[PDB]
Every structure is written in structure tokens, then in C-alpha cells.
Amino acid sequence: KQRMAAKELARQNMDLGFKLLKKLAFYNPGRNIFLSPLSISTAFSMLCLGAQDSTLDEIKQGFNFRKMPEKDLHEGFHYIIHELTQKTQDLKLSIGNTLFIDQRLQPQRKFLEDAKNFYSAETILTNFQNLEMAQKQINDFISQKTHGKINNLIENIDPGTVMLLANYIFFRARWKHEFDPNVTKEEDFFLEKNSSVKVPMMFRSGIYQVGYDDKLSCTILEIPYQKNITAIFILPDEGKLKHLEKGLQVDTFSRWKTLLSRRVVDVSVPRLHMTGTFDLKKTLSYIGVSKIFEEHGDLTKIAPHRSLKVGEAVHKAELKMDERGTEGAAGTGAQTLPETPLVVKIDKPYLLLIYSEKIPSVLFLGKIVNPI
Incomplete structure (x- = not known):
């Protein structure tokens, strides 16, 4: 129905x-x-x-x-x-x-x-x-x-x-587009500005739905799966994680969809x-x-x-x-x-x-x- x-x-x-x-x-x-x-x-x-x-x-x-x-x-x-x-x-x-x-x-x-x-x-x-x-x-x-x-x-x-x-x-x-294991290599992951740790980092360049939220100060990135399902990453600016967390409401996800736009992106995902x-x-x-x-x-x-x-x-x-x-x-x-x-x-x-x-x-x- x-x-x-x-x-x-x-x-x-x-x-x-x-x-x-x-x-x-x-x-x-x-x-x-x-x-x-x-x-x-x-x-x-x-x-x-x-x-x-x-x-x-x-x-x-x-x-x-x-x-x-x-x-x-x-x-x-x-x-x-x-x-x-x-x-x-x-x-x-x-x-x-x-x-x-x-x-x-x-x-x-x-x-x-x-x-x-x-x-x-x-x-x-x-x-x-x-x-x-x-x-x-x-x-x-x-x-x-x-x-x-x-x-x-x-x-x-x-x-x-x-x-x-x-x-x-x-x-x-x-x-939908798998990463190449040959390209993957250990790179820095920053717990904080000075302290960093090496982790296996995936990488690919291609068309991705991407955008930036000025309200919660974070970058949005969608990496779709082979069908129906997709993975969305929320990357806040430096020193605004707590700002992002508190600003989460019922309309947040709705807005993020309007800020999307297909672009060529060199994404790095661990x-x-x-x-x-x-x-x-x-x-x-x-x-x-x-x-x-x-x-x-x-x-x-x-x-x-x-x-x-x-x-x-x-x-x-x-x-x-x-x-x-x-x-x-x-x-x-x-x-x-x-x-x-x-x-x-x-x-x-x-x-x-x-x-x-x-x-x-x-x-x-x-x-x-x-x-x-």
C-alpha cells in the first residue's frame, strides 16, 4: 500500500x-x-x-x-x-x-x-x-x-x-567500485594534531557524491555499495567534533542531501x-x-x-x-x-x-x- x-x-x-x-x-x-x-x-x-x-x-x-x-x-x-x-x-x-x-x-x-x-x-x-x-x-x-x-x-x-x-x-x-589492494598503503591517522598512528589506508579517485556542511562544520562523502545501500562519512573540521555531535537533530540528514554534488574526488578511507x-x-x-x-x-x-x-x-x-x-x-x-x-x-x-x-x-x- x-x-x-x-x-x-x-x-x-x-x-x-x-x-x-x-x-x-x-x-x-x-x-x-x-x-x-x-x-x-x-x-x-x-x-x-x-x-x-x-x-x-x-x-x-x-x-x-x-x-x-x-x-x-x-x-x-x-x-x-x-x-x-x-x-x-x-x-x-x-x-x-x-x-x-x-x-x-x-x-x-x-x-x-x-x-x-x-x-x-x-x-x-x-x-x-x-x-x-x-x-x-x-x-x-x-x-x-x-x-x-x-x-x-x-x-x-x-x-x-x-x-x-x-x-x-x-x-x-x-x-559499487572496489578499491585496489595494490594502491592501499599504511598512512598517518591523527588522533590529535600532534599524536598520529599508522593504519592501512584505502584510496581511489572517481566520481563521488560529496559536499560540505557549514552549520555543523563537516565534510560529507557517500560511497555507494553494489546496490541500494550506501556508506556515508562525516568528517568534521579540526576541533569541532563535539560541535558536530551536539548539533545532530532530526532534520540533519535531510539537509546533508541538499548539499551533495557529483564530483571527482581523491578519497582516502582507512x-x-x-x-x-x-x-x-x-x-x-x-x-x-x-x-x-x-x-x-x-x-x-x-x-x-x-x-x-x-x-x-x-x-x-x-x-x-x-x-x-x-x-x-x-x-x-x-x-x-x-x-x-x-x-x-x-x-x-x-x-x-x-x-x-x-x-x-x-x-x-x-x-x-x-x-x-
Whole structure:
């Protein structure tokens, strides 16, 4: 259907990525940050199905699902999830959800039917009494969907756990124009003006979408993949990283598109491998989402006759960027229990933003202060 809700939803999921990145950088300055905003949004938007009252209110507030009808939210996610799904030529992009429900547990009929519909949720039975058995079963499932990039998603399972909501995303693609390994060579990467470090730097000269933002004082550069997906680099001027971070809003990405223009560019991009792990309980507290992790009898839509709360919530992300392309993967789990050519040299702290063009959505989001 003519569902323009996916676009508005993408606009808000986009803003949510920045929200977390701001707060994460604010509380953890001078460190690498990598995550998948889409993976976290889908997980907690699916969690909104079986929630109500202040628990629902706080989650909608933090994840920007507030200014939106209930209809357009889940209908929007179903559109994004279905359209993004591509296991076609030169582009593997998988995204899905899974409910690890206990046999004894009989959750509401509406919650499951909506989970299976809007989010294509796969029902799977588990025995949480056998912590050692349940863990391996769940970690193996995610390890299989992410082709072994996200291992041991769940480190500790609570005895009282009755359900585990799980989201996974896998991404593999090659550049539209690959870099030549012969040209790549170790060059300086400046953590600061004086301090530098040698890192493997890729290089190619060609037509790139490029521009410069005067408001946030940064250079924009798009390096598209073989199809649909593209990688956007945000290179701020010297001593304006904090200026860039704080200036991130919901309209930021929209503006950057108007500043683009196809030009011949001699781009220098470092090889990038990143691993991210987050305790979502601590993280989501930064955006006001806390009730979901406390007992308030708001998750009755999940269990009609049990007082449930979320115990352990975790997010893990993985990226490997090289000359051939990029391989991305992430997971999210939550337990419920009782002429001179233009030159753009990326040799200093920058932001990386993996974005799907044809299907507006941020698959991954990163802050690189040191590619090693």
C-alpha cells in the first residue's frame, strides 16, 4: 500500500541513532562507538506490542514513536523489514525477530499474532530451567543468522526468565567500485594534531557524491555499495567534533542531501574493523527509558496472570570494512522475567553511517576515533 509511514518512521529512527550516539559520546568520550539503531528500534517497537501505561509512554518517548499513530508504527516497521530483505545479487541483507517463549508460558493471542505479522516473528520453544541448554540454543540461533559474527549474545540467563525477545540483522555487500589492494598503503591517522598512528589506508579517485556542511562544520562523502545501500562519512573540521555531535537533530540528514554534488574526488578511507557491546539497561537510561526494566504490571499484554519486567538487555554489533566492501552484523536481545581533483582524506576522528537509500533506514551507525 501507499505507506509513507516507513519514511516518517525512518526519519525518527534516524534521529534515535543520533540520540544514543550523543549520550554515548557524552558519557564515553574519546572511544569508538558502533551500533545498529534499526536493530534496537525493531526490538523495542515489538516490545511495545505487549506494553501499556508509563512503560509504553517512556519507550515511545525515547524511541520517538510518540508523535505517530499506533497503526503507522507497526505497519511502517513491517514495510521496512520486508522491503529491506534482499538475498539477491551482490547484496545480502537479512533482518528478523524471534520470540523464545517457554512452554508453560501462554502469552496473549493478540501480542503473538501482531508479532508474527508486523515483525514476522518466529515462535520457538525453550526451557529456561536449563540455563546451560537454553543459552547455547539461543546463541547458536543468532550465530547462525549472523553467519558467526555475533557470538554469545547472551552471557547470563536468569532462572526466572520465561521469554527472550531477539532481533538480528546481517549485511554483506561490495562497493559499487572496489578499491585496489595494490594502491592501499599504511598512512598517518591523527588522533590529535600532534599524536598520529599508522593504519592501512584505502584510496581511489572517481566520481563521488560529496559536499560540505557549514552549520555543523563537516565534510560529507557517500560511497555507494553494489546496490541500494550506501556508506556515508562525516568528517568534521579540526576541533569541532563535539560541535558536530551536539548539533545532530532530526532534520540533519535531510539537509546533508541538499548539499551533495557529483564530483571527482581523491578519497582516502582507512580499513575498518569494529566491535560494539552495550548493556542496554544503562544505555537506555540515558534517554529516559527505565520503567521497562522495573516491575509495574505493565507487561500484562505479554502475560495476563504474571507480573513481568525486563531483566537483562544487550546489544552487540560487528563491522568489517575492506577494499572489496563491507560485512555488517548486529543483535539485540531482551529477557522478560518475574583542474586539481578534490581531496577528502579521512585521517582523523569521523562518523560512519550505513544508510539504505531506496528503502530509507539506518542499518548501522558508528563513531571512529581510531580504526585499529
